[PDB]
């Protein structure tokens, strides 16, 4: 029922998609009756460290547009000292919400999503970006295709957290997180979701004596991937280029 202006162009609000730290995401309709998502960021109580992190995310989102279709499309933006408006493509739903609703995940949709996740995370790594905070919420379903929504530059779950991030951070950090997302899509839980206590959870992730259970499934390829990603030592963990050449991703 409402309306907002981004670079002379008018957008009518359909619904509010999300909220957070001085930031509201909306589903909008433009003058050509096309659907988009607008993220509004209030900079009134924002400092220079915050502004430059936001400016850095917009710059990376803007550059990585051209390098991959697995990155959310950023159509337009308006930046002032009071706010930011980002006009982006609209997804159907985020991966976290889609997984929370779904009682079972189809092996084909799973393989397809995995491919998308590796291509997206691979792309950011080629530009010196390591996310380090990957979770299903950073992924959006856009016409059966997964897209990466942020680069960790600008939920606080810890279930997808690599052992190296706990120790106190290389492209291998993201492999651990992607492994945890695939583990959830495989077994219906993250490898440490059983641990109610958050400190015991952290003590279990770093501890090598704490064996991660990999139950036997029909897809033995999918089992090897999980076993390769979830190696507590970054040095002994599989790389993204090697994951893209794995039989799980490649064999039809
Ligand atoms: C359970 N939820 C809230 C949903 O069903 C839901 C979730 C996501 C939706 N799509 C959607 C969400 C979107 C975007 C584009 N489309 C863009 C963004 C975005 C925010 N920052 N950056 C740099 C990109 N975005 C987004 O942040 O979505 C969440 C609020 C769900 C996390 C829609 Cl239309 C509905």
CATH number of this structure's domain 4-92: 3.30.200.20
**Are the beta carbons of 121 and 240 closer than 8 angstroms?**
yes
Q: Looking at the domain 93-252, which fold is it?
A: Transferase(Phosphotransferase); domain 1 (1.10.510)
Task: Please give the C-alpha separations between residue 206 and each of 6, 148, 210, in angstroms, as whole numbers.
Answer: 46, 27, 8
Residue given tokens 């491919």 in the structure block:
115
Residues of the chain within CATH 1.10.510.10 domain(s) are 93-252
> Backbone phi, then psi, for 165, in 5-degree steps?
-70, -25
SS3 (DSSP) at 15: strand
How many residues comprise the chain? Answer: 252
Residues with CB under 6 A from ligand 1: 17-18, 25, 27, 37, 39, 61, 72, 88, 90-91, 93-94, 97, 137, 140, 149-150
160 Ramachandran zone, left/alpha/beta (phi>0; psi -120 to 50)? alpha
Distance CA(228)–CA(225), nearest Å, equals 5
In terms of DSSP H, where are the helices of the chain?
48-63, 95-101, 107-125, 163-166, 172-187, 198-206, 220-229, 240-243, 247-250
Which residues of the chain does CATH 3.30.200.20 include? 4-92
Helix, strand, coil share of the chain (percent; to 5): 40, 20, 40
Provide Rg for the chain, Cα atoms. Answer: 19
Alpha-carbon torsion, ordered 63, 67, 68, 74, to 10 deg: 20
Which residues, including other chains, have CB under 8 Å from residue 36's CB and lie 6 or more apart? Answer: 11, 27, 28, 29, 30, 75, 87, 88, 89, 90
- What is the CA(228)–ligand 1 centre distance, in A? 31
| Close Cβ partners of 187 (under 8 Å, ≥ 6 residues apart) | 215
- Structure determination method: X-ray
Please give the distance, rounded to the nearest whole angstrom, from the Cα atom of residue 136 to the centre of ligand 1: 12
Active-site residue, 133 included: yes
Q: Which of 133, 143, 221, 233 is catalytic?
A: 133
């Amino acid at each position: 029922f409402q309306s907002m202006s981004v670079k002379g162009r008018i957008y009518s609000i359909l619904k509010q998609i999300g909220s957070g730290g001085s930031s509201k995401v909306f589903q909008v309709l433009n003058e050509k009756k096309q659907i988009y998502a607008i993220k509004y960021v209030n900079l009134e109580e924002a400092d220079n460290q915050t502004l430059d992190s936001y400016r850095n995310e917009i710059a990376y989102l803007n550059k990585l547009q051209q390098h991959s279709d697995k990155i959310i499309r950023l159509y337009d933006y308006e930046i002032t000292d009071q706010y930011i408006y980002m006009v982006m493509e609209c997804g159907n739903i985020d991966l976290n919400s889609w997984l929370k609703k779904k009682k079972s995940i189809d092996p084909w949709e799973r393989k397809s999503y995995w491919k998308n996740m590796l291509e997206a995370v691979h792309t950011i790594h080629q530009h010196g970006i390591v996310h380090s905070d990957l979770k299903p919420a950073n992924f959006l379903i856009v016409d059966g295709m997964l897209k990466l929504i942020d680069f960790g530059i600008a939920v606080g779950t810890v279930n997808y957290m690599p052992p190296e991030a706990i120790k106190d951070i290389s492209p291998k950090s993201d492999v651990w997180s992607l492994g945890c997302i695939l583990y959830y899509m495989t077994y219906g839980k993250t490898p440490f979701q059983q641990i109610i206590n958050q400190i015991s959870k952290l003590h279990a992730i770093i501890d090598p004596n704490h064996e991660i259970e990999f139950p036997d499934i029909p897809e033995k390829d999918l089992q090897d991937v999980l076993k390769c990603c979830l190696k507590r030592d970054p040095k002994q963990r599989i790389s993204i280029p090697e994951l893209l050449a794995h039989p799980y991703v490649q064999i039809q």
